[PDB]
Amino acid sequence: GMNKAYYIGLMSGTSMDGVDAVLVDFAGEQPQLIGTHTETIPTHLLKGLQRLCLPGTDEINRLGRLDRSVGKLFALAVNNLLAKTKIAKDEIIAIGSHGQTVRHMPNLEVGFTLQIGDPNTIATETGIDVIADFRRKDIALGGQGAPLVPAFHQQTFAQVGKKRVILNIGGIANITYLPGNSEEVLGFDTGPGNTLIDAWVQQVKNESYDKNGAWAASGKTDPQLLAQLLSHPYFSLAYPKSTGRELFNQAWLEQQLSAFNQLNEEDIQSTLLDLTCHSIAQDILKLAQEGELFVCGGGAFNAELMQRLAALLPGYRIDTTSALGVDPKWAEGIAFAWLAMRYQLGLPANLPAVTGASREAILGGRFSAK
Ligand SMILES: [Cl-]
Ligand SMILES: [Cl-]
Ligand SMILES: [Cl-]
Numbered sequence: 210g211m212n213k214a215y216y217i218g219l220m221s222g223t224s225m226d227g228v229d230a231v232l233v234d235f236a237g238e239q240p241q242l243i244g245t246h247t248e249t250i251p252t253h254l255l256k257g258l259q260r261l262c263l264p265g266t267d268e269i270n271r272l273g274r275l276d277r278s279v280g281k282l283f284a285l286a287v288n289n290l291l292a293k294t295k296i297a298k299d300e301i302i303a304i305g306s307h308g309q310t311v312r313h314m315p316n317l318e319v320g321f322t323l324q325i326g327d328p329n330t331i332a333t334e335t336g337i338d339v340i341a342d343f344r345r346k347d348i349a350l351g352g353q354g355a356p357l358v359p360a361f362h363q364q365t366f367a368q369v370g371k372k373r374v375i376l377n378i379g380g381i382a383n384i385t386y387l388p389g390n391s392e393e394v395l396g397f398d399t400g401p402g403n404t405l406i407d408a409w410v411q412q413v414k415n416e417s418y419d420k421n422g423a424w425a426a427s428g429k430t431d432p433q434l435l436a437q438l439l440s441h442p443y444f445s446l447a448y449p450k451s452t453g454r455e456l457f458n459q460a461w462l463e464q465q466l467s468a469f470n471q472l473n474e475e476d477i478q479s480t481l482l483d484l485t486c487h488s489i490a491q492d493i494l495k496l497a498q499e500g501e502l503f504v505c506g507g508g509a510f511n512a513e514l515m516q517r518l519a520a521l522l523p524g525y526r527i528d529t530t531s532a533l534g535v536d537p538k539w540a541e542g543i544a545f546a547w548l549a550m551r552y553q554l555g556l557p558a559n560l561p562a563v564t565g566a567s568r569e570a571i572l573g574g575r576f577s578a579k
Pocket of ligand 3: 355356357358
């Protein structure tokens with residue numbers, strides 16, 4: 210557009226909430242969010258994606274097929290975003306697509322990360338160039354491949370004179386530390402965000418999530434369970450660190466609970482919420498005892514989580530990223546649009562102090578719509 214610099218960002222989280230699609234203008238000083246869209250993952254594709262953890266079921270062939278399917282769903286998400294915003298595909302510079310994570314294993318001897326959602330398919334079915342596959346360059350340089358939001362967070366949320374934490378509560382929670390001086394930006398996965406509280410409410414209540422943490426609020430934390438969960442070696446690891454689904458998952462949880470079979474389900478729920486809150490708070494208080502905390506992702510909307518976090522961080526002012534003018538629901542999609550913009554402009558996006566990569570590098574691959 211006319212002094213517009215339109216990018217699309219596409220993110221499909223590990224929690225299966227859908228493909229989030231954002232149309233962002235980066236021509237100005239702050240990102241301007243133009244339009245948003247969530248594309249529902251159809252249940253046949255949801256089941257396929259779940260099967261990728263079922264051994265002896267032709268998982269590689271299934272991966273290749275679903276990579277195509279996810280690509281088609283990401284393109285549909287783009288096209289539905291264009292139908293609601295009514296901006297021509299030709300006005301879009303590039304799509305920044307995270308894809309959908311299937312494996313994240315940065316700490317194997319030979320480290321790797323695996324996102325599907327074929328960027329050739331997205332480019333073909335949208336008519337817009339695609340920048341995708343952002344994590345693998347960071348891994349190639351010895352990094353965790355994650356989090357990648359911190360450089361975006363520094364540019365968008367940092368305030369000279371203020372120590373800020375940006376906390377994204379997805380399946381896994383990650384913090385960005387923005388010290389508010391010459392000092393380096395930090396960031397890492399603290400541990401579980403919503404992944405375990407979601408798994409437990411799905412198991413017991415067959416709801417997809419615990420709305421506003423109200424079920425957690427009805428229960429009482431078991432201190433023995435909490436202490437045991439918090440003793441996982443992951444929480445004692447130094448940053449840079451990230452984790453996917455290999456540590457905090459249903460199988461792990463079920464084995465953790467195999468002495469607490471007679472606990473009330475709502476007490477387990479409360480305890481799992483506290484695992485998230487306490488692991489996050491502990492990490493934040495190691496960076497600074499006082500500051501400003503800005504929350505984004507699904508957990509920003511959980512009022513029980515937010516007040517528990519408030520009680521744990523009395524020296525913090527606590528808000529969602531809304532206070533900094535960025536919708537908590539859309540923050541992560543915007544970051545991926547920003548990642549495409551960085552590529553477009555030939556600029557690096559990872560940070561060595563964040564991921565452990567040996568240097569800042571240009572992230573992603575470009576797939577032509579032509
Ligand atoms: Cl399938
Ligand atoms: Cl086709
Ligand atoms: Cl990230």
